[model samples]
Target: KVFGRCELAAAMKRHGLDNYRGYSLGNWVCAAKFESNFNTQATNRNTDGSTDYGILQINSRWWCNDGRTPGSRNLCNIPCSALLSSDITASVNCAKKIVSDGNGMNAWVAWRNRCKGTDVQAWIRGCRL
Candidate 1:
């Protein structure tokens, strides 16, 4: 619902992403929802108890707070907080890049497969735009 209409679909279109269906989007949304409850403002502490930030739960120190080079400074070259700062389009596009570049949706696909037991349409229904 929230993820399909707002996050995944928009992000995919914004970033020219393909190769994923509604089911894939659904699983990804579910995972993110489970992790962060769709709250872009959420933050977490790392294993050493350091603070991470924003919807995708980026790490502040390594990504944003480090103050390094522009691309090197933040996660995906955009701070998580900045990504969530009243610009959902930007945030979703950034997340699309992160998912596509980092994990290639393997984890998400696996999760979806598990949940729907090979019924791709069922997974699609779980999160459709």
Candidate 2:
């Protein structure tokens, strides 16, 4: 399911994504906006045969097991399919693991190119926190 900006923000906040690893809620929102456009089932194939799954675009090579990505670490110990669910619980939990792993928000190219080092506060404006 697709989510509105405020709705996604609220959902992420509820999952403790706010200020996760020093990234503001707006930063998360910005990442999601560019990564998946709030589409829970988003998926993208990588050049290395790995896959990115879900709103946060968690990678299969290191985070989740797609059973297709060779040498997957599956550090989150979850199936890549779980990240595509609209519930987002698994996605959020996995994202936390990623951030805690010293990657910060750099785990996502979208975050690095579109959200990082920018004033993301505007992404959350007009939304009820």
What is the overall TM-score of model 1 with all chains considered together? 0.53
Identify the runs in model 2 with alpha carbons over 4 angstroms from their true place: none
Instruction: Write one digit per residue (lDDT tens) for candidate 1, span 83-122.
Output: 4553455555655655555555443332444433444334
Worst 10 residues of 1 by lDDT: 107-116
TM-score of each: 0.53, 0.97
TM-score of 2: 0.97
Cα lDDT listed for each candidate: 0.48, 0.94
Off by over 4 Å in 1: 1-23, 61-63, 66-75, 105-128
Best candidate per lDDT, number? 2
Going through the candidates in order, what is the number of backbone clashes in each? 0, 0
